Amino acid sequence: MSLWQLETNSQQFLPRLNGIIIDCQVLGPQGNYYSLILQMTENNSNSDYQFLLLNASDLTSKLS
Amino acid sequence: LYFPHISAVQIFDFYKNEQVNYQYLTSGVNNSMGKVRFELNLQDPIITDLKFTKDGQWMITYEIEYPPNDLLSSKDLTHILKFWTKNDNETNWNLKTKVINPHGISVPITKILPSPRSVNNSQGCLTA
Amino acid sequence: STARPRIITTTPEQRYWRQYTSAQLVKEHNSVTHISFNPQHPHDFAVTSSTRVQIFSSRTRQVIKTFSRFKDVVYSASFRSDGKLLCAGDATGLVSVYDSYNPRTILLSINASTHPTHVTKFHTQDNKILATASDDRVTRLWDISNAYEPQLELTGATDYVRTLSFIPAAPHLVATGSYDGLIRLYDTRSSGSTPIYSLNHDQPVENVIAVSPTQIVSCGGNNFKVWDLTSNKKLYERGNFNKAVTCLDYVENFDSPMQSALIASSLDGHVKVFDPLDNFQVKFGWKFSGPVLSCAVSPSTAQGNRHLVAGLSSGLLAIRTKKKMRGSEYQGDQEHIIHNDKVRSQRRMRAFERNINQFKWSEALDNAFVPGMAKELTLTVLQELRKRGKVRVALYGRDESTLEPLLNWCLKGIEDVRSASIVADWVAVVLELYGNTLESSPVLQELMIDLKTKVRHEIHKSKEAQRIEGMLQLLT
Amino acid sequence: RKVPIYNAFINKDLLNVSWLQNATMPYFKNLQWREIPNEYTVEISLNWNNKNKSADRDLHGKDLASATNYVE
Amino acid sequence: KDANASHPSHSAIQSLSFHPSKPLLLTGGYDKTLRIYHIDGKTNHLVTSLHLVGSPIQTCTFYTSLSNQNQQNIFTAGRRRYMHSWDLSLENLTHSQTAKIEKFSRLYGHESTQRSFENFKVAHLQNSQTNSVHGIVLLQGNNGWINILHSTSGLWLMGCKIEGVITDFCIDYQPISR
């Protein structure tokens, strides 16, 4: 997951997530949390969705 | 309840209806990097059979490693057997033994049966 | 997010004995006959050589005391249980008792006999009584208080007695082994001077040791046998040795994975370790320049670096040793809540591992073939790149100048069974990927000509191996 | 550590004991003094050298959502 | 009466801060402990303590959100490349057995300008186009650089540069209208 800083075109990264990112959102009055949907494309038989709520402060999984 | 996901095992507690763990049980490009483009054609090791002894303290896992395409050794699958053990208090299985190409080379382990409690106090298994 | 996985690149009993790495060879004037360890800290060990006895510091591994009063050759340096007192024998037959670390004063001197006194040992449970063995074939039992007559005079050996042992937990029992091949057990409680029973070794007895209260190991001739007194028969016997075994020592309850170890000298330059639990079976051995006459290991309670000492007839002494802002330090003992988040840094990664993590496929291959690179480690990086699916990618931007390092290793790796299959894959791609550059480069051409000769040689070996494999089936 | 009592109430058979936790926060407990022994010491769990556990981390600091890696 | 008499500190008192509304005093130092005392002037008992292993405290301060009065928070920093935030909202301060602590350690590409979080201050920024008001964490850089971060999310908002070595800074508010 890449946060592009548009002022300077920089970017912050959160790598090695559990699956490919289908959806991203900034969820809060002050952007406290990031809500992500992960896919886990390894399993071709089924689509394995996972909802991940990350704390924007330290990018730790607040709720998986 | 143990689900053999591809190259990983999902431990899921159906009483609470919550996942309790997700563990990688094989080598390979599993979370080292995100595969993109032709890297996405690679197949990680597949956990085919996963079984517990009657005592429940040992876990036997059978894996198939697929070679990359476009090589001379692109057709010689590698069959692996692994014996994992874990104390009840902790949640992470620790690998104790690893057997590469059991039964010979390129011969699958089609069946696995943990032994009954009578023989070796459930610390044996059969592979066929 | 998860931490990035790290790239994945004998017996425990052998691994313990492999820790005696540091080796020192000291030269003595004559054959070192006997070696003894002080039971007490610092556990200095004494070596008998020529006309002197030298005590070596455990930590310093150098001589700290020398007892040169002896006129003729010395035959023993055993300490007492307390370690204050050491006794020594002499060819003249005089037994001299000195205070340990005070060579000048001679606390007690006893004339055991006119013939040589080869063995002098302090009785383990009782400090006052000292045993002496002489070529007179009488193993007299002396007491420090009574220096004019022995307390008891054991007799009945028709040949030289050169081995005295005291059985733990049986202070009344005394064991003697003569060159008759007979090991005799005596009881001091009775009148004595006549064995309780005799054990036949069939070969001259060089050293008798009581490993445990009920088991005695007697090493004589080319074999050592363990005898149980309750059964009065040898339980087990080991004859792996070639020359005649000379000396034997036992240590128990030390920090090794093996609780107990039994070392036996060979007179062939071999001293090998035996564990009493596994039927006295071999686990380790060392080879020396010449025959070994004495072997010793530091006691169980060494309290520091362990020592292995071997004595050679040339006078060489071999030692192997197993070495053993005013508020910054508050640590929050009185506080309600302690919060810890510090995470130790991961173990330092090599150049090849860093390149793979950073997706530098070509540079990772280069780090594989560098001078002074382990062959096993070079195999992993090659296997990793194949597993990642990056073999052609690692070989795209290359020419003859940077292709030869890979081919050089392939020329050597093809011989190895482990790397034979890997070499085939990489060599297949480079030929399929650099066919045209091959024609216009002469140096590359010879790199294949020798490769074709070598790969042909492997084909002959594998065909040959199949043939021995075929006939081996016929035998079974 | 002993926590002093600054007030108490006793009605028929129950006794209400009051003490201060933190600085000035009053806490209360009701006990039946009739059944209490002659000398009785109430035991209370107060923060003292409490290791701080974050709900989003396990004992070793690995994030809960993260998957366990493979180690031989 | 002295504030630290009830529970003495094991180092110099590097920073002091009163709570904006409640009668509390916060202390910090190289002891690595955030001791909070209930200043009444006669007893001054200690409300709570939090030892931060390996995190010397050069400066600590309370923070109360200007819009959401229920939000209370403590920021502490030292000669380290990270900052700690301690949420005291609801019952976290006293009742909770555990402390809700977050570490700010990401500068979003501006690591070179910042060597240490030790010198920082907290202010209020009103996002005019939306009229929303939030807190900002101000830091001192290596070369005249002042790095400004979002107090809650920790995002890098903007940076200010002056010529010469930055020695100190302060914040002033100018009301415009209602």
Add this chain to the structure above:
Amino acid sequence: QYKLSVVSGGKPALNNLSSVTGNKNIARLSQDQRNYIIPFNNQIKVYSVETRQCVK
């Protein structure tokens, strides 16, 4: 004697519509922002964010 009954849950629900992108997630965070509501294919789970457990 025997009887059949569903016990555990199923996959989380998504707005599986091809055109809509960025609005696939349907879960919502309470106004007090103390718990997250997630619809499943067979139930609706309310998780407390602070304790990371399914309160309801």
Add this chain to the structure above:
RNA sequence: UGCGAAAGCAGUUGAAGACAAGUGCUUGUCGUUCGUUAUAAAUGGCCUCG
């Protein structure tokens, strides 16, 4: 694509519509349909907390 063992044994990869480009004709494409078991290439590589 079917079967099977992993080796292999058999069998497929058609038609229409629309758009673009070049010169009614040619080629290529399809977030278009019907039917059959049925190279890539926008300089673009994964965080910090010792």
